[PDB]
User: Fold Calgizzarin from Homo sapiens.
Amino acid sequence: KISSPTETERCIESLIA
Assistant:
């Protein structure tokens, strides 16, 4: 789970949009 930080950046950016 949570292999790379790029995945979290994509989940935060989508919640903002």
